[PDB]
Amino acid sequence: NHYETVFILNPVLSEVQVKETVTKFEEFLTSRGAEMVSKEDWGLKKMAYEIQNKKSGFYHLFEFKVAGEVLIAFETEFRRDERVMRFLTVSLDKHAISWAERRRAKL
Amino acid sequence: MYLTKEKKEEIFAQHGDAKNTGKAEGQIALFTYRISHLTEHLKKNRHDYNTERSLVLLVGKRRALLDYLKRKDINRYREIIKVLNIRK
Amino acid sequence: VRKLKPITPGQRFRVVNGYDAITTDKPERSLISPIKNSGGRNSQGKMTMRYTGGGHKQRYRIIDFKRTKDGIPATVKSIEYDPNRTAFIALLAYADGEKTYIIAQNGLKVGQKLVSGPESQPEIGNTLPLSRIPLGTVISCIELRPGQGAVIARSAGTFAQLMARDGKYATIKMPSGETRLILLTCSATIGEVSNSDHQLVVSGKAGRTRWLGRRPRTRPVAMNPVDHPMGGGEGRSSGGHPRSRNGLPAKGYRTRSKKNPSNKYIVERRK
Amino acid sequence: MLIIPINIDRALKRYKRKFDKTGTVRQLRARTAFIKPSVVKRAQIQKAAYIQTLK
Amino acid sequence: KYCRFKKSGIKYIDYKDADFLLKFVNEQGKILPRRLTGTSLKYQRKVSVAVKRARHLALMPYVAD
Amino acid sequence: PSGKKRKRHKVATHKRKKRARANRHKK
Amino acid sequence: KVIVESTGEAHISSTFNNIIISLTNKKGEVIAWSSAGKMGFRGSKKNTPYAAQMAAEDCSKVALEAGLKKVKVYVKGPGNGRESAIRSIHNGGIEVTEIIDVTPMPHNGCRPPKRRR
RNA sequence: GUUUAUCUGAGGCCUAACCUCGCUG
RNA sequence: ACUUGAAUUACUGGGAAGUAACUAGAAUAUGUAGUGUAGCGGUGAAAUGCUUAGAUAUUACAUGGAAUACCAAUUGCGAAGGCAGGUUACUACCAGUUUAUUGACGCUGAUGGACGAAAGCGUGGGGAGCGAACAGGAUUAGAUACCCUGGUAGUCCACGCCGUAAACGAUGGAUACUAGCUGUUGGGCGCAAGUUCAGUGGCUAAGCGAAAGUGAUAAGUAUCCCACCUGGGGAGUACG
Secondary structure (H helix, E strand, O other), X not given: OEEEEEEEEOOOOOHHHHHHHHHHHHHHHOOOOOOOOOOEEEEEEEEEEEEXXXXXXXXXXXXXXXXXXXXXXXXXXXXXXXXXXXXXXXEEOOXXXXXXXXXXXXX | OOOOHHHHHHHHHOOOOXXXXXXXXXXXXXXXXXXXXXXXXXHHOOOOHHHHHHHHHHHHHHHHHHHHHHXXXXXXHHHHXXXXXXXO | OEEXXXXXXXXXXXXXXXXXXXXXXXXXXXXXXXXXXXXXXXOOOOEOOOOEOOOOOOOEEOOOOOOOOOOXXXXXXXXXXOOOOOOOOOEEEEOOOOEEOOOOEOOOOOOOEEOOOOOOOOOOOOEEXXXXXXXXXXXXXXXXXXXXXXXXXOOXXXXXXXXXXXXXXXXEEOOOOOEEEEEOOOEEEEOOEOOOOOOOOEOOOHHHHHHOOEOOOOOHHHOOOOOOOOOOOOOOOOOOOOEOOOOOEOOOOOOOOOOOOOHHHEOOOOO | OOOXXXXXXXXXXXXXXXXXXXXXXXXXXXXXXXXXXXXXXXXXXXXXXXXXXXX | OOOHHHHOOOOOOOOOOXXXXXXXXXXXXXXXXXXXXXXOHHHHXXXXXXXXXXXXXXXXXXXXX | OOHHHHOOXXXXXXXXXXXXXXXXXXX | OOOOOOOEEEEEEEOOOOEXXXXXXXXXXXXXXXXXXXXXXXXXXXXXXXXXXXXXXXHHHHHHHHXXXXXXXXXXXXXXXXXXXXXXXXXXXOEEOOOXXXXXXXXXXXXXXXXXX
16 A cells, blocks of 8 residues: 655765655665655754664655555565664555645645 | 355355345355355464354254254255255 | 383383474585594594493585685575584585585575675575674574684574674673683684484483494493492492592593683683 | 753752652652552542542 | 634544644643543543554654753 | 451362372373 | 772662662762761651651761762652752762663552552 | 883783684785 | 345444464562671561571672462443453454445243353463462460461363352343433534534432332333243152
8 A cells, every 4th residue: 555664874974865865765665566656855854862872863754655565675674774763654544545645745 | 264245146046046145055055155155264373262152053053954954854954054064 | 302102111202303394305526525433443442431332324525614605695595414423404505506415504495595704694504704794693603713614502592692892802792601702714604503402312221322323321320340430338228428530520620621722712710 | 861051059959849740750759569450440439439538 | 721623624534733732732742631622532542552653653743942 | 258268278179289200201 | 898989879779668778879879878867867757858868868978988079869759858868968079960760650550559448 | 200211910992923714826 | 016124235433352473571489799796587475497518698690480460340341151561463253424235134031052250171382479278386175266376279371071169230131111310431503602413431210129129221001922930848868
C-alpha cells in the first residue's frame, strides 16, 4: 500500500555522501517495483536527546508506494547500513494521505 | 484468505448470478475458498489458535449449509460436493 | 532424525540421523584423493593417541576452504555426505568451468547461485571479509590468517558472531564462548553450518563406536599399580587424586601456556 | 529532571514544593515494595466504588 | 471541555510536528491526561501513539524539564 | 459465609498431600 | 592532583537510611565527600535534617579552602535532608546556582524486592 | 632545589636482527 | 409460497484480538578508565555482609538480561484463560446503515474435539533483578517463621507433556415481554438541542428472596435444551 519512511543520517558525513546514500536507498525501491512520490530532505536538525553520542542529524522522508511483500528487505537494508542512526516506516490510509497532500501543498 | 470484491464477484459468477450473494452454493464455495486459503497460513503459523478456531467455525457453517442442502434436495448436495471436492 | 522402534536391545534407544538435506549419493571422481587411516601409530610406529582403531575405510574429498575466486558466481549442484567431517559438502560449479567442494551452510539448497568476494551481498552462502560483514551476523568458516583458509566454526551446527570493529581487528565470539580479535582482512561465510542435528544422534550400540573408528577404553581404576598411577588395591578402590599417566592432575588443571605469544588477542577465556 | 533557576531559603522552598507537587515523594515508596496485579487491581475497584458512592 | 478534534475536521494526528505535539505534553515531557484537555478517548489514543512515535524519532525528549 | 465451614478442608487436603509426598520414592 | 577550578557541583544522594554529599569538579572528579554516618551519627538519626546539615557543613569548609566558589547542586533520592543539605552549603560560603533534581525513576525496569511484612 | 654527560628500574612506539603465513623473491 | 428469524454481499468505522520478524529509552547489575578517603549497607535497635587488596560516591564508555513510568480508566477487545513501549507482514472478529441476495438454512447439545492462569515435567540455550529449598545474623523459654545478609531450581526463549485454580458475576445457553433517573465507549440522524441501535457502571419503583440483596446487562413473568443437588463426618477415602 502507501508507506512513508523517515530516517536520520550521521552528521559527520559530507554533502556528497549524504547525496550518495539517499540515491542508493531510492534505487533499492525503484528496482522492486515502487513509485516514489515525495522525497523530502529537512536537513541538519537537532535531536531532543543524544544518539550515539551525537546531538544532530540529517533527516529524510521518502513517502513511497509499493506492495508489502518487498518491505522486509527494505528494512534489513536499513539496519545493515552503518551511516544511519534511526529509521521509522509507517503506513498511510484515507486519513493520512490527504493530510500529507495538503501539507506538501503548503510549502 | 485474502478476499477482494473482485475475487468474491468471480467466485459467485463461477456458480452463476454474480449478484446472487446469498445462494447456498456460492456461500459454500466462498467458505471452501477461504478455508483452503487459511489452512495454508496455519502451516506457517501453527501457534495461531485464534485463526484455528475461526477455521473451525467456518467448517461448522459449511457443514450446516451442507446439511440444509442434504435435507432439502438430495441431488444438489451430491453435485456441489462432487464439484467442490468436499466430504472426504 | 528418526527414532527406531525397540525391537532389539541393541536398538531400543538408537536414534538415526535423517539426512534430509542430502540429494546425491555418488561423489565426484575428479575431486577425490586416496586416504588411509592409522591406529594412532605415528611415523616410527609407536602408538600415540590411543583408543583409535579402525573401521569402514573411507575416501577423502578435497574441500575448498580458501574460496579465492572473487567475482565469479557459482551454482550449487548437489548436497552430499562426507565421512571425513560432520557437515554436508554441497558441491559447487563455477561459471568458468571449475568444480569445487566447499562446505555447506544451514540454508543452502540445490540451485542457489552464490558469489564470493568483497562486493557480494551478505546472504547465506556468500563469503565476505570482516571489514564488510555488517555487525552481529551469525557467520562461519572464519579465517584466522588472510588467504590461508577456514579454521573456526567448521563443524556441523556451529557459528560465531561479530561484535565490533576497531581499526585493524574485529571482535568475534567463537563457538566455545571465547571472545577474541581477528584481523579485518580475514574472510568468513554468512550463515550457520549444516547438519545441526548431529548432537541428537544416539548409537544404542557398542558396534557403532567401532564403525566410527573408536576402540574400548579401560578405566585406570581397574588396573595394576605398574600400569597407571591410579590402579591397585585389594577390592574395589579409588585412585586418590585423578592423574593422567604422569601425575598430571586431571580436574581443573589448566594446560595453556601463561606465556603464549598469542595472549594479546584473547578477551575472555571460556575454555 | 527538575532544573530550577535561582535569598536561598525562598528558592529552596520553591524547589521543595515543586518536588512535592510533581508526584514523586510518594512514587518511590510504592516502588520500594512489589505489588502484584492481583492486589493492584482491587485498589481501583475499591476506589472507584467509593468515589461513585460519594456522589 | 470539548474535543478540539471533534469540533474541527481533523481525522489524523501527525507526529512530525514537535511544535504542535507540545500541547498534549507535561512541562517535564509526559503525556497529559485527556481529562485536562477534553479530548475523546479515540483521539487520545492517537495522540499518545503520536507522542511515542515522535519520542522514538527523537523529536520529543523522554526526560525533559 | 463463615470460614469455619471452609476450614478443615485445608487440613484434610494437606495431610493427604504430605502423606503422598512422604510415600514417594518407595518402590 | 585534581584541578579545583572555581566551577563545580555538589551531588547530594539521599535515601531512607543515610545521605552522602560530594563536592565535585566540573568534570566528574570528586573533590571532597561527607556522610551523616561519617559525622558520628551512627543509628536511626542518619536520616535527619540536623545530621544532613552537619554532614554538609563538614565538607563545606573543607572544599572551600581549595578553590571552589560556585556550585551546581544535583539532588538525588528521597529522604529528609535535601533541604538542610543545600541550606548549610549556601549558608557556609560557596554559592549555589541550581537545585537540579536528578532522582532516577525506572520505566517498569526491574522487579522490586519482596514487599516486607 | 635544577642543569649537563653515564648506570639502573618500568611502560609506549619504530624496524633492522629473530619467528610465522600467502603467492613464487 | 413469504420475510420478520438466520446467513451472505456493499459502504462507513472499531479496538492491550492473535502469530512472526525488527527496533527505542529510563532503571538495575558487571567490567575498563579518571577523582577521592573511611566508611557503605541494614533494622524497633543490632549483628551477619562489602570495605585501607581503596568500598560507598561521581564522570565517560562498553556488555548483557527482563519489563514497558506518563498516556492509563468500574476504558476497550477476546468464547474463556487473557491481552499494555514503537513498526511491518500474515490473519481473525465486531458495530451501524440507502443497498442487493438465499429463504427456516434456527436454539441447545450426553459421548467427543479444541483452547485453557500460575505452579510442575523432558530436551537445548540464556540468566540483569527477584527468589522456593538452603547457609549465617537477630527476636524468643524454644523460632525448622515473621525481620536482616547471601543464594540453587524457577521466573525468560525454541519444541513438546499434565490439565488443575477463590478458572468468581460463587449467578449455563437461547428468545420474548415488564417504570424511571444518571455517566461513559464505538455508530446513525441531526446547523444545536436531542433521538435510535450495539456494549459497559451507579441509584431505585413494582415484582422476587428466609434475609443480606437483586432489580431492564434481573435473582421479575413465561417456553426449550444441557449439567448438577438430596443431613454432617468417614471421603473425593478404599477397590477396579
